[PDB]
Design a protein around this nucleic acid. Structure first.
Length: 56
RNA sequence: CCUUGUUGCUGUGAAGGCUGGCGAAAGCCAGCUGGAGGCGGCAAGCCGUAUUGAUCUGCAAAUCAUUGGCGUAAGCAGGGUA
RNA sequence: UGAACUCAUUGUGACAAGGGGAAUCUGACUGUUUAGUAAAAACAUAGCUUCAUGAAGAGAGAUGAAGUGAGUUCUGCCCGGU
RNA sequence: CUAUUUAGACGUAGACGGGUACGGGGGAUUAGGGUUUGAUUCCGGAGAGGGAGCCUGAGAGACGGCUACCAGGUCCAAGGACAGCAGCAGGCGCGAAAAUUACCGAAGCCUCCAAGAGGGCGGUAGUGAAGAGACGUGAAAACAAGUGUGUGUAAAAACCACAUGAGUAACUGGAGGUCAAGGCUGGUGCCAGCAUCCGCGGUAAUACCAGCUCCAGGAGUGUCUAUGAUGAUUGCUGCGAUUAAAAGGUCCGUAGUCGAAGAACAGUACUUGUUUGUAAUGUGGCUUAUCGAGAGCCGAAUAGAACGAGAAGAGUUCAGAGUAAGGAGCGAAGGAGGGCUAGAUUAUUGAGCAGCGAGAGGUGAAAUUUGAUGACCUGCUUAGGAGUAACAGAGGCGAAAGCGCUAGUCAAGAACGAAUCCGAUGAUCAAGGACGUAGGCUGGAGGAUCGAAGACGAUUAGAGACCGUAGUAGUUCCAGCAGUAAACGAUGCCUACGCUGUUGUGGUUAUGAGCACGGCAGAAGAGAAAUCUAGUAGGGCUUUGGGGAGAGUACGCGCGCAAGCGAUAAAUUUAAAGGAAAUUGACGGAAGAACACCACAAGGAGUGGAGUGUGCGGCUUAAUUUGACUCAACGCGGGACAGCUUACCAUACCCGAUGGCCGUGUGAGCGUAGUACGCGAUAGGUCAGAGAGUGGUGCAUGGCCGUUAACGACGAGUGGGGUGACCUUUGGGUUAAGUCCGCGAAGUAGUGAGAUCCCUAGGAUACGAAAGUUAUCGACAGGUGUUAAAAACACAGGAAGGAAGGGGCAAGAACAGGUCAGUGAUGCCCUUAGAUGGUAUGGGCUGCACGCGCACUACAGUGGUCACAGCAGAAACAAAUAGAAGUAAAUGUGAUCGAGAGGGAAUGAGCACUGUAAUGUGCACAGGAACGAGGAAUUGCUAGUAAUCGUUAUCUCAUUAAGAAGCGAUGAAUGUGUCCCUGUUCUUUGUACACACCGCCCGUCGUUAUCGAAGAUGGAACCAGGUGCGAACAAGUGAAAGCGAGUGAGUGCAGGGUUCUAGAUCUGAUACAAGUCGUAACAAGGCAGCUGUAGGAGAACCUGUAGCUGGAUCA
C-alpha cells in the first residue's frame, strides 16, 4: 500500500519567526547565589508556601 | 529313467572348541584352533564377447589367430532304455 | 628374520603376470537361449497371492491349474459391460 | 641421541584433541562475602617482513652483522649493485578512534686509549576540554586577565618581586509522572514531530514548533558504547520446585560426596608463637612548597616458606560393650502379592430339531436393515472363545505399572512377640544393568463379544462428524522387540522434633494399653491467597527452574525391524504472558426456592373468515411529504386532510442588521389606466459580517415521556473478621411490601413501602322556611372459633369487615429506548431571490395488482313490521301540511310478517342543506353484492365486574364520528388453587468476557516483507601432518680433482581439520489495519474438556483404546 515523503519539515516552515528581545548580562558564581538566596527567604521557613513561577 | 567315468594349485576364513583379560551379574574384548560356501584368482576342460581381424575358386556346405566368460558344481560325458 | 660388502643404465630382469576412481538407466544373485548374422533389459529362480477337490498304488505340511518375480516399504477407488 | 633387552607411562578428581591467551607486582567497583580487568613507569619472557643456517667473541643462533629461498621494492651506462622505522621526528593507508620532519657543553645515568670526546637513552618546551587540584566573572566606597624591569634557565618561556595602565569577563540540558522547576501567549490540527519507560497530537496540546519567565549543575554540561553496581534476577554467607518456570515412571548399582555409644592412643593437616617474605602502588602518620592536590622522611603489612607449641574437633586401634543402625535366624499367625496343575454357576453369539403364523429392530422422532427359504418368542440338544455381577467399602496386598470363582502345589518377602547370633557390615547415587497400563511391531496358536479404517441410512447451507445399520485390523494366548502417559496425592530418599478428639486393618496384652500401616475433624503456627505431604531447622545425598515467543525445534551423535525415542542450540522478535489466587459486575443453551386471570388450569365474550370504516408495507404517479418496528411500531404522532392544516407537485407573484469601499436632489429609488404625469433619498452595486428554515444528525444534548416496576430493595455511624481489594454472616415461619416474628459478633437511627389527599357510599344536635344542603363521626381482624410468636380464614352483626371499594402520588441504579415534525429549549453540518423563506389559484396527501394490524354492521324468529305507552345520568330545544340535527335506547302491552319479508354493498333521474368553492352531509324513489357463525393461531376479564343498550350542554367540529374520554340503563358465569406453560424477582453455580456474548478466539488458503534449514554442482582462506624433489652451509676422506653424513628453507602431488560464501528449487518461523472459508476452545460453548498411542481428513480437527479432574459429583 502507498506511502509518500512529500510533507517532510512542514511545521518548521509554517511557524512565524519572532525575534529574541535583549536582556542584561546575568550573574555567575557566588553573585548568582546571593541573588537566589534573597528571593527564596520565604521557603527557608518551615511554614507557609513558596512558588517559584506563577502565571496568575 | 537305469548302470558308469571325471576335482590338481592357491586366496578369503562361517558354525563349533581352548587359553588370557574385564565385569555384581548378564555377556563383552584379544590371540590361537577348525574348515562352510550353486564364494574369489588360475590349470585340464567346457563355452562363444570383441577385433564387425584372417579366409570367402576356403584347410572347412561354419574353420583359424589373438582377446574374452565359467571352471568344489540348478558342471561335463560313454553305453542300455523310453 | 636382521646386518654388512658389491655392480655402467639395476634386480616378480627372459617366461608368466589386475588399469583405477565418480555417477545415472536396468535386471536381485549363480544358471539358460535363436547348432550357421541377435547372449540381452528376454527365460528361469527363491519368495508372495489366488483357484479346484476327501478322489487314489498318492490322501490336504496332499495333488493338480494360473499370475507376479529375492529381501525392505506400500499395494487407493469401481461389479455399470464381458 | 644411538645399539640390544623389559612393557611400561597417562586418564571421568577430565587424559588426548580443538578454541583462546605475554605472566605477575597491581587497577576499577565495593558495609561484609564478592564481580570484573591488567598492551601500558618495576621484574621476568619472546620478536625484529616470513622461515631456516652461521662466523667472531668471555657472552649472539645478533638483524642500525653475514648467507640462501619466498613475498615485496630501489638504482643503472643493462653488464651489475643496494636495501628492512614493533628507535626519534615524519608520510600513506585502515578505521568510531591518538601530538613537533622542535632546543639540549644543564639535571639522571651508560661508553671509551680520556683533567676530554660521544648518546633522539634521558631532560626542556610546543600540541589536545581523555584524568586530578586551587581560583576570576564585582564590592558598597573602590575589582582577574595587560605592560615594563629584575628573577628564573643550558638558553629560554611560564612562575614569583616591584612599578605602570585600566574596568573587560557563561554556557549546556530541562520545566505531564518517575524527577527539581509554567495548565502563560501565538502557530499546527493522529499532520509535522516528541518520547530510555509510561504516553502526547483527530482546531479548547502545562508533553510538537517558537517567544517569555522559572529550575539544575556550572568552565563546563548533553549523547553513544563496553563494564561494576541496582540484584537475595546465580543465592558460600543468601533464592526457589502442590497450583506461578521447576522432584527423574519404579528399582538395583560403581566412581563421587557423607557416616554410632564407651575406653584409650598418636601428631601430618588444624590453630598459634618466633623468624623470614613487599621497590612503586595502597595503608597509619609527621615535615616543607601562599593554600590544596604534589614532594620528602617514618612505622606496620598479604599470600608463600623455616623451626617450635597446644590437643577440643577430625583421625587410628581395642573388646568382661552390645542403637527406637543393619543383616542372619526362631515361634504363632494374616493378605484380590506372584508362577503352575486340575475343575465350576450363569451369560452373549452360532448351528440342529419342535411348537405358533405376522411382524421384529432402533430412536428425541424416524429411515437404512431383516421376515412366509417361517422371523420374533417358548422348548430341548449341542460348539466355541472371553469374563468372574450382586457381597464390595475414603477395605486389603504389591517397588511402581498393577491384583477379585474353587481346590492342590512351588519359591521368596513385610509386620508382630521374645534374656537367639554376628559386629559397622551403613545413607544417597553420574556411568552401567533389570521391570514398565494401553496402543504399536516380528513370528506361531486361535477368533464368542466389542470395534479404528472403509461403506451406507438420516440431520443440515454443507456434514466429511455427532445418531442408526453393518464391517475389517486389532481386542485373547505363547516367544520376543519397543520405552511413552494428567505413569498425579501435579508434593524425591533416608533421619529428627512436634496438640487433641474420633474411626479402621493385623498381631500382642498387667485388659490399663502399645507396635506397624491408614482415614477423618478441629487447633496452633505457616503462606500472596486458595489451603496445609506446606509447622520447627546451616542434618546428609541426588534430580531440577531463572520474562514471553522461536523450541523441546535445527545440526551432529547413541539406541530401535519400523513407528520413533533419548539428549539438546542459534539467528530473529516482543512489554508483558487466555502467568497465579482471591474481589465486584456482565453473560450462560444451569441448578433451587417464590409469585401473578395485563400467567396458566376450570369458567364467560370475542379476534383470525364476509362487506364496509380506518392505519401499515408494496407498486404507480407531476406529487402520491413523513416518524415509529418483540412486549414497550400499525383509529399512534391529540394524524375525523374540499380551502387552511401541509412538510409534497404545477403555474404565478412577493422579500435583505451593521461596517468598509464605489454613486447620488443636475434626482439614489417609488406610485400609475406606465412612459407622462404624481412622490421624493426612504429604500443604491461590491467585499466582510449578521440576524429565517415542518432542511440533516436523539450515536452531540436538555427537558418530558415510556420501560426494568409498581419491584423490595437501599444508603449512614459505631462494633467484629481479612494483608488487602471485601463480608457482617447458618438463608426457619409471615405480607401486597426486609411487611414482620424468631435467632445471632453485632447494635442504633432514616429514605422507599407504609403512613400521609381527593372523589363515591352512611350520619344533624348545625342552617333554611323551604322540603335540600353540608358534616373532627363511623371499621379496629374488634367479636366468636381455630392450643409458640407474627398473620389468616370462615361466620356474625353492621350504611360500610380483613390494604372498606376506585383512583392519585410514588426509591436507587439503568437504557448509546422515543421525540431536533411541540417549543424564541439546543451543539455541529447544509440551503438562503432562479430560496430548502412566505403568499395565491389549482392538483395531491383520499391513486390501486396485492400482503398485514385494529374497529363497525351482520349472518335472523331469545327475530322484522304497525301503533301505543313509559323510565336515566337530570333539568336549555324559533317556526315547519311528504321529507329534508336534537331531551334516550334497549324496554312494556297489542296487532301484524313467516324461514334469505334477515342484510343493505356497487349504481340511476332527481329534491334540499353547509360552504368562498362540493368533491362532504341530509331526504324521497328505485336497485338489490358477499355473508347461512369463521383454518393455523391469538386477546382481555373475579361483581354492580364481563357482555348488552343508548346518550353526550365532553374532546375534535362551517359542514363532517363507525375515534378517544366520560356517563348512566339492563345485568352474568367459574376457582378460591398451582409453578406444568409464559414470563418476572432472590439465593447457591461456571468463566480465557470488563470495551462486558453484537464479547473473546483457532487453523488452512491468497498477497507482501524479514531471518533460518535442506539441496545436484562449488569457491575461498588458514592450520598441522604424509610422501617426492631439493638452495645454502658443511664434519669426515683425499697431494689434488673430487666425494659427501648431517642441519634444512622453499616447492611438487594426494588427503584431512577448521571457519566463511555461491546455488535452480523446496520447506520452517515471525510481522502482516480489518482479504477468503468455516467456527475448534472459553457457559453442560450447544458431542464436558485435557494427556499418551494408532488410523483418517480442505482446514480448524474427527474416530477407536487405556488414563486424569485442572468437572457439571467431597453425598
Amino acid at each position: 500500500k502507498a506511502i509518500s515523503l512529500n510533507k517532510a519539515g512542514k511545521v518548521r516552515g509554517q511557524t512565524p519567526k519572532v525575534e529574541k528581545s535583549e536582556k542584561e548580562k546575568a550573574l555567575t558564581g557566588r553573585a548568582a547565589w546571593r541573588a537566589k538566596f534573597k528571593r527564596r527567604q520565604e521557603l527557608f521557613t518551615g511554614v507557609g508556601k513558596f512558588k517559584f513561577n506563577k502565571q496568575g
